[PDB]
Every structure is written in C-alpha cells, then in structure tokens.
C-alpha cells in the first residue's frame, strides 16, 4: 500500500510528530476503555431498590405488610463521527515549489501534504480536548454558534445532576469565600462506597495563582492549596489529591474522583484523527484531503462532580 499510495506513507512517517492529547492527564489509566464503534450508541442497565414505607410490626395477626420497591435504569452513550477537509499541494508538484528554506506557495498559503496534515491534526486534537473538557463544540471564543449535538453527549463541565456552586461577583477575589463555597460543595459531594480513591482538581490560572498564596494574620508554611488538599484528603480517606491548570477553563473549578466505578471514559477506537482514503485530484496542483474523528463516550455517576463558578461582575 505504501508503494502505491504516497499519502499513506507520509501519514505513517509523520504520525509520530503529533503530540499526545492533554485530556489524558485528567483521567487515570484504568478510567479509559476504548470501544469499537464509529457512529451509534451503547446501552447499560442498572438496578435500584428503595423502601416504600416504615417497617411493619409483626404483632398478633396481620396481612398488610410494607413493601420494598425496585426500579430499572437504562443508560445510553451516543457517538458521533465528524470530518474536516483541507487543501494541499500534489506530490508531483512539490519540486516546482521547493525553496531555499521552505516548501509551499507563501503568497497563496499552500503547504505540503505532510505539514498540512500535521497542522490539521493538531487543531482537531485541540478541538477534541476542548469538547472532552467542556461538553461543547464551538470555534468562537464567546461560545456561541455551537454545533447541535446528539443527546446523552456530555462533558465534565456540563454534566447534569452534579453539585454546582457559585461564588458571588463581590467575592470574586476573596479566597476565603471561594474556599467556603468549595467546602460546601465538598460536603454536598456523595462518594459513598467509592471513597478511598484519588481525587482530581482542575483550576484556571487565576485560581491557581490565588491558591498559591499563603493561607490567612497570614499563616506560615500553610497555603490555601495545602488547606484544600487537606480538606479533600478528609473526604477521600487520605488519598492522593492532584491539581492541574487548564487554560480552557475560565473562573471554573472542577473536582472529581479518579475511580473507574464512578466516572469512566469509553471513547471510540477512532476518536483521534484518522486520514480518509478519498483524495480530490484535478488538473491543477491543488488537492484536497479529509480527516475523520469520533466524539462522545463520557459516563459519570450523579452527584459525584463539584463545579464551582466564580462570577466575574
């Protein structure tokens, strides 16, 4: 195949130069399990039990007894396949565009196929990281004109039925108020049996800079970050608490455990960019290529993620 098709050989020889996605730092190795499905859905079934009324006293003769009810829940994860097209130069025409230190028409913004594919793959990986973190797909910095997505497609920041706290605008710079809101959310967190697990906090750079200040008369050898780590260690049975900073978030704090039982990422085995076999060719020197990627696959238990939003005026 490599001899017959130049593009496949170039993709194989340049695939190693693409950096790994940053989403991997947000999850444990066991939390991620790939699935073989491009487009479609997957289903799972859970069973719950509940008490209908107070217990019945067994005294003398009785026929009416309190009942214990049961319920079934079907959880569906949807997957979507998306494609991008990019222009490039035909392989046979590169000799007419090679220069002293570059290859490609600068005046017309034309690139060799390998470099164009690398740049497009990097941009697509950035988009996928943004989707995994925020639960939305958009190219505007404001966040409008979002692509309409299928239901049961959520991210860590937009997951429903989770603990949500809001720090007031007047207390935007008050780390004591921010920590009070974080403590309230931590108390409202419900880990249950899966408590002896590592915890993960993702913060914006401004929140990290506020955290690295000493805890407050100010204390010595005790920072707000250390106080937060101790607080989370109180509720995770003194397990490791990891703290990361992401530029994608803005005035947001995301706290969640790293246990596969509570939160699991089951992405498609084709989620990362993959070249398509269709290459548009014409009599000119400009060709077109296609890249495919699959989105969706995040599953989380309810009331297990804390999302703190610091309102900015």
């Amino acid at each position: 195949l490599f001899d017959e098709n130049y593009y496949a050989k170039a993709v194989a020889n340049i695939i190693g130069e693409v950096k790994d996605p940053i989403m991997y730092k947000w999850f444990s190795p066991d939390q991620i399990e790939d699935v073989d499905l491009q487009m479609g859905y997957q289903k799972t079934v859970k069973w719950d039990a509940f008490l209908n009324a107070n217990p019945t006293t067994i005294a003398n003769e009785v026929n009416t007894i309190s009942t214990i009810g049961f319920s079934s829940e079907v959880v569906r994860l949807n997957y979507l396949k998306l494609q991008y097209k990019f222009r490039h130069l035909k392989q046979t025409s590169e000799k007419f565009y090679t220069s002293d230190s570059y290859i490609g028409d600068i005046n017309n913004n034309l690139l060799p196929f390998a470099q164009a594919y690398k740049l497009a793959s990097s941009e697509i990986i950035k988009l996928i990281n943004h989707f995994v973190l925020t639960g939305t797909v958009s190219i505007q910095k404001d966040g409008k004109n979002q692509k309409r997505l299928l239901p049961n497609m959520y991210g860590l920041l937009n997951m429903p039925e989770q603990i949500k706290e809001e720090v007031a605008s007047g207390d935007k710079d008050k780390m004591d108020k921010i920590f009070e809101k974080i403590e309230a959310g931590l108390s409202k967190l419900e880990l249950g049996d899966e408590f002896s697990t590592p915890m993960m906090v993702i913060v914006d750079p401004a929140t990290s800079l506020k955290l690295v200040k000493p805890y407050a008369a100010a204390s010595s050898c005790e920072k707000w970050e250390d106080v937060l780590i101790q607080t989370i260690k109180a509720i995770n049975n003194r397990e490791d608490v990891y703290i990361e900073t992401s530029n994608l978030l803005k005035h947001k704090i995301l706290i969640y455990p790293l246990n596969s039982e509570l939160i699991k990422f089951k992405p498609s085995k084709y989620m990362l960019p993959t070249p398509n076999e269709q290459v548009d060719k014409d009599s000119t020197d400009v060709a077109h290529s296609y890249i495919d990627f699959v989105l969706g696959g995040l599953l989380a238990t309810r009331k297990t993620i804390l999302q703190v939003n610091i309102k900015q005026s």
Binding site: L1, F2, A12, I15, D20, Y24, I32, T274
Partner: peptide, 25 residues
C-alpha cells in the same frame, strides 16, 4: 509492519494511538 490495504493501515493507526497512550501513562 507492511499494510496490505487502507483498512489495515487505519487499524494500525488505532493500535499505535493505543500504544502511545499506554506508554504515556
């Protein structure tokens, strides 16, 4: 590895991505 066809090439890409994430972890 010598890909016979584009399907095998895509499967190799997926396996390479999986091995890369395993190595990163």
């Amino acid at each position: 590895f010598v890909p016979i066809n584009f399907t095998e090439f895509v499967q190799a890409i997926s396996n390479t991505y999986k091995q890369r994430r395993i190595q990163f972890y």
